[PDB]
Each structure stands twice: as structure tokens, then as C-alpha cells.
Subunit: 351 residues, 4 copies
Amino acid sequence: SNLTAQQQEAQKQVDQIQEQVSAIQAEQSNLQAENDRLQAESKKLEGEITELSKNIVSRNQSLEKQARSAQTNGAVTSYINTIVNSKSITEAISRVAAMSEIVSANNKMLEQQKADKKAISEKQVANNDAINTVIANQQKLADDAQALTTKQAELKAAELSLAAEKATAEGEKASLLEQKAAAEAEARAAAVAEAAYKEKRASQQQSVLASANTNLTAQVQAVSESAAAPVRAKVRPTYSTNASSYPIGECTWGVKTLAPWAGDYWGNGAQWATSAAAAGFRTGSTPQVGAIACWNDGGYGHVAVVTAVESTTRIQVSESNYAGNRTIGNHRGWFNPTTTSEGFVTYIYAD
Amino acid sequence: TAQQQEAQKQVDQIQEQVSAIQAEQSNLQAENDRLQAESKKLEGEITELSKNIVSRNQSLEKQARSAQTNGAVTSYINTIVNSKSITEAISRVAAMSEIVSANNKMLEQQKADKKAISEKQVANNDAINTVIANQQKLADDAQALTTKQAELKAAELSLAAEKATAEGEKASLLEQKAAAEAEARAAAVAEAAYKEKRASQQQSVLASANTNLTAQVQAVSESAAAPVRAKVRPTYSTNASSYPIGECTWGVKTLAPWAGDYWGNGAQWATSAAAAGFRTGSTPQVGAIACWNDGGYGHVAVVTAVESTTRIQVSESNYAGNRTIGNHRGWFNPTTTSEGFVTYIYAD
Amino acid sequence: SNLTAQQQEAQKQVDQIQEQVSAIQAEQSNLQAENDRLQAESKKLEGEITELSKNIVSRNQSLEKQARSAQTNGAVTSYINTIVNSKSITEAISRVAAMSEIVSANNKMLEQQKADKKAISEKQVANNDAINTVIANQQKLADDAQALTTKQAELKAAELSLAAEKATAEGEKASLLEQKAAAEAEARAAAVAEAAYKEKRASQQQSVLASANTNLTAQVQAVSESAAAPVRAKVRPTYSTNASSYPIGECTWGVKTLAPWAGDYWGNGAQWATSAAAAGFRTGSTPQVGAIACWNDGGYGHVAVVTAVESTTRIQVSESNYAGNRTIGNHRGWFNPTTTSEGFVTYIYAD
Amino acid sequence: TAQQQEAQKQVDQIQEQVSAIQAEQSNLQAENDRLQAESKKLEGEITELSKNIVSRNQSLEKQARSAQTNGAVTSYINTIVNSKSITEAISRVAAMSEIVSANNKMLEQQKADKKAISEKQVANNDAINTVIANQQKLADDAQALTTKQAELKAAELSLAAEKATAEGEKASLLEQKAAAEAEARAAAVAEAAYKEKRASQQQSVLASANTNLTAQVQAVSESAAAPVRAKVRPTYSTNASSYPIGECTWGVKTLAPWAGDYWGNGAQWATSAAAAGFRTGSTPQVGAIACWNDGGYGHVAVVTAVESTTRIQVSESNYAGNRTIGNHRGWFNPTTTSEGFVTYIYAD
Ligand SMILES: [Cl-]
Ligand SMILES: [Cl-]
Ligand SMILES: [Cl-]
Ligand SMILES: [Cl-]
Ligand SMILES: [Cl-]
Ligand SMILES: [Cl-]
Ligand SMILES: [Cl-]
Ligand SMILES: [Cl-]
Ligand SMILES: [Cl-]
Ligand SMILES: [Cl-]
Ligand SMILES: [Cl-]
Ligand SMILES: [Cl-]
Ligand SMILES: [Cl-]
Ligand SMILES: [Cl-]
Ligand SMILES: [Cl-]
Ligand SMILES: [Cl-]
Ligand SMILES: [Mg+2]
Ligand SMILES: [Mg+2]
């Protein structure tokens, strides 16, 4: 080699910084590649979780209908007597043998339900861990991009410093020493930027963690305390506390009795949601316990108060004047409120 | 004579009652027909006013709010000072009077519609009530008419006996009178049974009013079944360590600790919640987890206020770059956002 | 017996008519009982048909996703190479053994799908036959009620005729012979009513069968030929046939190119449904081929033209300016239009 | 001198071009800001007018139609002749003028709103178009500015050489000029590549316009998949012998022979159709089978005309006791009937 001692020192600074630069770039490619495959694992797990979810919900309903039919009490006693309905001279019995198959099919169903609940649970943790890793990697990538900008600026200046030590000229040493001073100033700018980045990142996270010091009630309190605070309910009218405005036994009289917050002159049940909306009440398509269910059939319609909710297509209700019975109470048990002869259902909420 | 007048008096008294019932039947039936028509017309007008009132309310809240949004009003005061620059014929301040005139005209029409619907509601309600009372009166009259017409029959035969002839015939229609009087007693016993039934049925109805919602809801859970799908629920962690700091999932888990621990990207929370046994739906409720699915990562938040399906407030984390938990948007429409299809997960 | 010859003749008429009366009443109870149990069989079959239907639809989607993943072509070649990725010194392989289980699970799925399609088919015919029998019985019950009214009126008169032949009195024979003449007149009235019933029933059915002499086109023609005929589309404006009102490459320009019946000044894609509705176009939530899909995100939104539809949550579309690509064409393949970053989807229909 | 003026001229010419670009950048950016604001305001007003126009159209069709329903107008002519009976101060004919005045006022406001939305649409559309054109011009200017500023640099160094001193220095900044001119050439080649790319991209976009819907739909079916779910469909009977005469099912089967043969009560038709591979949905289309489910027997019909989701006509059998096939209701709302939840089954 024709290398000097001073030139080797400059070469060492270039090789050290280049090593750091390549190390950052290698990790960037490493993390970006890991994220790509983890995002793919997640997508696949997500599709499988969706598949299991609908099956679990569907199978639960089937298992609850099959339980109800197998545990109705009043009709089940006859199903136990059907097995006993065979002893002496009845030709050929295949009722008891067929009873084993429906129980075998039943036991097979809950075992598959148990397996699906196990599988979705396992797929959830793996998916969640994959998603968490990807976010941590993305944060590491953001940190590396700032570090790379700094180290590449340092490398530039170091390479110019090496170019000065090699220079076989008085004219040129001076030229690239001006360029080195310029490059070193740029490297300082990059470092100060990275310092501000770390400074900002740290305080931002502390500000995020500080906001966790709260709860829902305080959060809901802040809405009503603000200017944009629910004041649409202020313009409502004070209604009567009794049902004297509705005739005895009617569905309207019944709902007014159970839900005294309803209006006094809201007419036929069919029009209650229409009048309630005008009065400032919130309406919607999903049942809530305590909400007034309003069915519109283009005629008189019907109203009731929701007493229990399992889904949008499965509720219980307390009502008056259903199928000729004018007493207030539970007339139907569980039923689907979207598929009745009273028509389009809409719910009126208290708040 | 004299005895014949007494018989004639009984016929005329009962005939008077019979005609009175028939007159009232025609009276009530005619009143019901026109009241049912008045109701139908009022119903159509109430529907017309209702949609206008709701629509106009939304319009009135989109207006005024945009011209009185805290932060934005200072610019509206500067607009008059900026339009005052002499270049060169100014009609910006004069045109500002027209939008305020149009605004004031809108709330005055809203106030008139709320007044009109209120008046139409009471008239309609009274009309409906009157019709039902009349129908009950008509049912009572039909039973009374059957009785009085049977009494009239016997009374007319009694008069026919006093006019005599005499045969041969007195004895004949006195047997018919005794038969008619027995029929009249049968009609009376039938009307008594009718009143007996009507009275006890109404008492049974009035007895059922002695209740309230809580007792009603209690009877459902006390019955064989009875919501028992929530019994199989799981114990989730009480902290948000399973979700990364600043993410929307971490924020919702912080505000709604009843949510799951490994429910992944916000988009899939409703899907996992439904599998876990939670109830989901399309209408916002305060305290519900709003889950938006965009076919990607999606988003989650907790509903803090609800005015309608298309107007809510929420508290969330990581919205538009801001990773702190809080209110980021104010009032907004959750169905029309870049995070996609909204679904709500309810606590119970 | 102290029975006369004439009295026996009267007694015979009573016994013959009573036999007919009891025969009708016996059949009424017979048919009413059969209908009750057939209505119950139907209800049970209906619930089972609903159960099978949702499973068949759900399982079809799963089988088509599992087929797609197992028949993607470009990624499947790697799945065939994974089995070949084992020969000499690889420790323990359970990738080929696990491949048998997913195929076993796949083959088990289509066999259960085939069994469910077989079961629903069988349950459909049994249910349909049960429903048909119940309607035929109801028609027979309507016929019997008319016949019963007639025969009971005949019985009344016959019993009075017997009461006249027994009568041991000059005073009473004459009385119940007047009652018999009255009863016979009532019996004639009942017969004439039953004749009118049969007369009406026969001609009504012929009038119903006559109305079947038609088809949809004639039916749709009669609507437009009537006074209540679609004339809301008359007030529309004639739009330009080119997309010069929209800038090159935009989504609006693309939709206008493929659907020239769209408007010229409808602005950002998000507002197209809003302007279309004002212009008199019909809008809705379900995709149709040739409909303009309008997504509203509270911003600029997006528009496209629907090119294929499998369900509400699965369509294909041709569009312009998707994910940076400004050419008109198919960018996404099959996708769910309700779950995208462009927001709330609404469809604008040509008619 | 003289040579220095030539150098000064080159600096002043290029500086003029540089300032012209920068002036236009500020000009276009300012115009876009105010046009984006005009658009936002117009958008809100278009939304306001749209809902009013749709709402008012429904109101106008519920009105007039009720006062001009064939069969019902003869009674409206008799109402003036019946209110003319002298009993005793008549204000029924005078009040009839007010509802017609209110009606005529409604269509005049509808006509004004259709005029206003049309005008607002063109102004908004032109505003949006201008903004996009400006954004493209801004992208072009940024590339041109980079080039002209590089040319200016070299020209200023050329002027600095002619002023000289002279050293020692002429030679120094002539080397810098040669370096600057090389940089200016690099900027020009970059702008050329930009124009090269921009031009070919637009040609590729314009090329894709050479198509139509049919070719587009053809490419879907020609691709790997391609709707092939309809391939597995079944051959049903061509007559309605499987359904009893006069029933709603028999009627729909007669009009829509593509329906199934053993689909039972009308209520379950959508359920069986979905299992059979047919597409279902919540929006009416002409020729679709409407299936109403009331938790009981339900009802079916064939859609013959559609105005909206809440306004259709249908042809059906066995409606309100009438078992003939035909139009029984005219225009009606299929979501608000006593037959329950409506769902439509589509042919394809
Ligand atoms: Cl909390
Ligand atoms: Cl009812
Ligand atoms: Cl009762
Ligand atoms: Cl009860
Ligand atoms: Cl934490
Ligand atoms: Cl974490
Ligand atoms: Cl963490
Ligand atoms: Cl959406
Ligand atoms: Cl046809
Ligand atoms: Cl896009
Ligand atoms: Cl492009
Ligand atoms: Cl493409
Ligand atoms: Cl036939
Ligand atoms: Cl048949
Ligand atoms: Cl037949
Ligand atoms: Cl409904
Ligand atoms: Mg905040
Ligand atoms: Mg007809």
C-alpha cells in the first residue's frame, strides 16, 4: 500500500460509519420483510376468525333451538313416552334406534362448537401478537430512517475528509476541506433533527400515557360540559304521568302505562315514532330494553315496550291489546319483531 | 176503553225507547264515519309536518353552527371589516342581511310547524278516542235493542188482546203474549250476561295496569328463559397491555375495559365480539364500542353522545395522527367516514 | 211399539237427514283435526328448511373461498412444492401428513353440502304437499258449512213433521203444521243460498283461471298504459353524450365514459347520488349490473360502474382513478363495497 | 462594458421568467384555496336543495293524487254543491282556494329549487375542474422553476465573470459557471423526462376510454372467474300445477315461471330461493319476486313498476280476498304492509 498513517485514520472513520450505515439498511430490509409476511399471516388469520365467528354464532342459535325443542317440558314428556310405546306385538320399531342418531348428531355439534371456540381463541392471540410485532417494527423503522439520515450525512463528510488526505495538490486540499466543513455542518443539522425527533417522540408518548388517566363517565361529562353538548332534548314538552288520554285496553294505553315518558296525544300506534321524532325523541332500528317498539302497517299499527333483547330479530315485549287480549303483559314470549303482521318496526328511545 | 189506553201507553213507551236506540245507532255510526275521515286527514298532515320538522332541524343545526363554530366566528367579524375596503361598490354586508333574514324565517316556520303538529295531535287523539267510545256504546245499544224489541213484541200482543173482538182470540194471543214475555225475559238475561262479562273484563284490564317496567322485566328473567346467554361470558383483563400504546384499540380498551384482549385490528372487533357472545347492532348507544370496517385495519371508538344514527360524538385514540385519548371530531356522521362500515358493540 | 205406518215414514225422514247431518259434522272434525297436525308439520318443516338454507348458503361461500385458495394458480404451485420439499436429512416432516387432513376436511364439507341439498329438497316437497292438502281441506270445510246449514234446516222441518204425526190433538197438529210450513220455507231459503254459493264458487274459479292467460310483459305494459304510469322520469334533462365536463383520469370522467346517461355537472363522486336523486333518478342500497356505485366518505368520495354482482357484499366494478391508477378498467376484482375507505355506498340505477 | 450589459440582459431575462413562475404559483394557489371554499359551500347547498326536492316531490305526489284519484274526483265536485246548501254561512268553497293556493305555491318553489340546484351544479363542477387544471399547472411550474433557477445561477456567475477585477478570479468563477451550466442541463433533462412521462401517461389514460360497458362486462366473464354460481341452477317446471289455484304462489309462478315448484308459503320463498342459488336483496327491481314474511303464511308477488324503495307497483294473486292475477293496489309502500318484512328475489 501507498497509505499514510493519517490516511488510514481517515479511512477508518469512513469504514466505521459505512459499517453503521449498512447495518441500519440491513435492519430496514429485515424488518420490512418481516412486516410483509406478518401482515399476510394476519390477513389469513382474520379471514379464518371471521369464518369461525359466523359459524359459532350460527351454531349457538341452532344449539339453543335444539335445546328448547329437547327441553320444552310440556312436549318433551311425550317424546319420552314414544320410546316406551313399544313392548309386545307392534311389528317393527325404529323410533328408539333413530333417537340415538339425533343425540349423536347433537353431541357432535357441541363438540365442534367447543373445537371452534378453542380454535378462534388460539387464532386471536397469534393474530394479536402478529399485529403488535408489526407496529413495534414500524416504530423501529421510523427511528432507523432518522438515524440513517444522520449517519449518511456523517459518511459524506468523512469521505471528503479521506479525499483531502489523499489529495496530491495544494489547490484541491483547500477545495474539499471547504466541502468537508459544509458537509460537517449538514451532519450537525441532521443530528440536531434526530435529537428533536427523539425529544418529540418521548414527550408525545408521555402525553398519550397521561390521557389514559380517565374513564367513560368523565369522558361523557366533558361532552355535556362543553359547548357542543346535547341541548336538542331541552325543547321537549312535559307530558302527563297517566294514560287517561288513551282508551282503556288499547296498545297505546298499555305503553303509556309502562312508559309514562311517552306523549299524550300520539294517536294510533303506527304514528308514534313519527310524532316522537317531531317531539325531539331519538328513533332507531335496533331494540333496547325500555324502548317503545312502534310497528307501522299503513293502518292502525301497534306499540309495545321492549322488556328483553337477544338480537335485532329476537326480543320480548310487554304490550296491551294483542290478538284480542286487552290486559297489559307478556303475550308472545320470544319473537322476531321484523316479521309480524303489524309491519315495519321502529324503536323510540328514552334518551 | 181505559184498559186499552194503558196497553197503548206501554206500546208507545217501549216504541219510544226502541226508536231512541235506533236513532242513536245512526247518530253514532255517522259520527264515527266522519271522525275516521278527519283522523285519516290529520294523520297525513302530521306525517307531512313531522318530516319537515326533522329535516328543518338538521338544516338549522348545519346552519348557525357553521356560522357560530368556536374559532370560526372571529373570521365572520373580520369579513365585514375586510369587505369594507373601498373596492369599490360593496354588497357583501347587504347580502349578509338576506341570509340572516332567511335564517330567521326558517326558525319562525319551524316554530309554526311545532305549534300546528301539536294542535293536530290533540284533535286527532280526541277523534280516535271518541270513535272507540262510540263503538263501545254501539255494542251496548245492540244488546239493549234486542231486549226492547222483544218487550215491544209482547206489549203489542197485549194491546191486540185488549182490542179483542171478542172470541176465541183473546185467549189465543194471551198465550202468544206469555210466550213473547218469556222471550223478552230471555233477551234481558242475555243482556245481563253481556254487562256481567263486559264489567269483569274491564276490571281485569284495569288490574293489569297495577305494574311497572321493572316488574315486567323481572318477570322475563324469572320465567324459564330468561336471558341466560350472558352467563357464559369470559373474564377479560382489566388493563390495555395487550394493545400497543396510542392505538385506537388501546384507547377503547382503556375506556371500555369490558372489551376483549386479543381482538386485533379495530375492523374485526365486532366480528370477535359476536363470537364472544356480545350483542351487536346498527344504532349508536352511549357506552357502546363503535367498530368501523374498511376492508383494512379499520378503527374503533367508544360512543359518548348520541343524537341520531347519523349524528354522534365519540372518544377515541389515534385519529388523524393524534394518539391521545379524547374527543377529536365533535359531532359527526359515523356512516360517512373513511373508516367504512360502522357497527356498534353493546355492553348488554 | 205404538208406531203407525205414517209415523215410521216421518221417523225415516228424520233419521236419514240426521245421518247426513252427523256425517257432515264428523268430516268437519276430521278435516279440522288433520289441518291442525298438518299446519304443525309444516311449521316444523319450515324451521328446518330455514336452518338448512342458511347452512347451504354459508357453506357454499366457505367452499368457494377454500376452492379459490386451493385453485389460485400462482400461489398453488408453491403448495405443491411444499410436499416435494422433503427427501434426505430434514429431521421431522409433518407437512405432507397435515395436507391429508385439510383435504379430508374439504371432502367432508362437500359431502355434508350434498346431504343438505338432498334434505332440503325432500323437506320442500313434503312441506308443499302438506300446505296443498290444508288448502284443499279448507275449501272442503267451506263447502260443508253451506251444506250443513241446508241439512239442519231440512232436519228441523222433518222433526216438526214427525211431531205432527205423533200429535194426539186436533188443536196441535194444526199448530206445528204451520211451523213445518215455516221450517220448509227456511229450508228452501238455505238450499237456494247453497245453490248461489256453488254458482258463485264455480264462476269465480273460472274467472281466476281466465286471468292466468297473461304474462309479465303484458302486465308491465298495463301499468304504463294506465293513468298511474311512471311519468316521474319525464322531467329529467337530456345530458351530454361525452365526458368533457369531467377532467381526464378522474373517477367521474371514467363513469361518465362507461355510463353516458349520468349527469354532466354532478361534481365530486361523493355527491353523485344526491344530485341524481334530485334529477329524478332512482337510488338504492343493492348493486345491479350497469348501476353507478357512489361512495361518500364526507370528502371527495368515489364513483364507479357495477360490472358484476354476486351479493350485496360482493361485486366487481369498472372505475377510473383507484389507488393512483387513472386508466379506466377493473382494478380490484371481487370486493365488498360496504367495507372500503371510500365510505357509504349507494347505487344509482338507469331506470 | 457592452459585454457586461449582454450578461446583465441574460440575468434579467431569466429572472423575469423565474419571477413570472413564482407569481403564477402564488396566483394559482390562492385561486385554488378560494375555489375549494366555494365548492364546499356549494356542496352543502346542493345537499340542502336535493333533500328538499325529493321530500317535496313525495309531498306533491301524496297531494294532487289524493284530490285527483280516478273515482274520487266526482266527490270533490259534489262537495262544492253540498256545501252550497244554505246552512248558513259557507266558508268551505273559500277555504278550498287556500289549499289550491298552497299547492300552486309548492310547485313554484319546487320549480325554483330545480332551477337553483342546476345552476349551483354547473358552478360547482366548473370550480372543481378549474382546481384540478390549476394543480396540474402547479406541478408543471415546479419542474420549470427548478430548471430556470439553475439557468439563473449560471447566468449570474457569467455576469460576475464579466465584472472581473481582474485576477485570478475570472478563471475561478468561469469554472463555477461551467459547473452551474452542467447543473442547468441536468435540470432540463429532468424536466424533459417529466414531460415525457406526463404525456405518455395521459395517452395511456385516453386509450382506456376506447371501450364500453358491454366489453367491460365481457372481460369479467372472460376472466378466470367470472360469475359461474348461476351455472349450477335447476330446471323447474314451466307451469303452476304444484301450487293451488288462486293462491299468491300460484300467481307468481304463472308470471315468473323461473321460480321454484315446492317453495311453500310465500313467506319462505326468499329462504328457499337463496338456498337454490338465487340472488336476494332489499331493493325492488321490475320482474323481481317480492317476498313478504310476517312470521306466518306471508305473501308473494311480481314487481311490475318501481319508483323508489318505498313506492312500487306489483302484480299478484289473492290480495284482500281477490284470487285473480292482476294489479290490486296500484302504487304502494311495500315496507309498510300487514304482510311484514319484504325481500326481493332477482332473476339474475
Ligand atoms: Cl372506564
Ligand atoms: Cl294485534
Ligand atoms: Cl280482555
Ligand atoms: Cl297477558
Ligand atoms: Cl399501558
Ligand atoms: Cl404491546
Ligand atoms: Cl405497550
Ligand atoms: Cl360504509
Ligand atoms: Cl310469463
Ligand atoms: Cl381511491
Ligand atoms: Cl395513470
Ligand atoms: Cl386497470
Ligand atoms: Cl293450473
Ligand atoms: Cl294443487
Ligand atoms: Cl290445482
Ligand atoms: Cl316489516
Ligand atoms: Mg384528544
Ligand atoms: Mg285483478
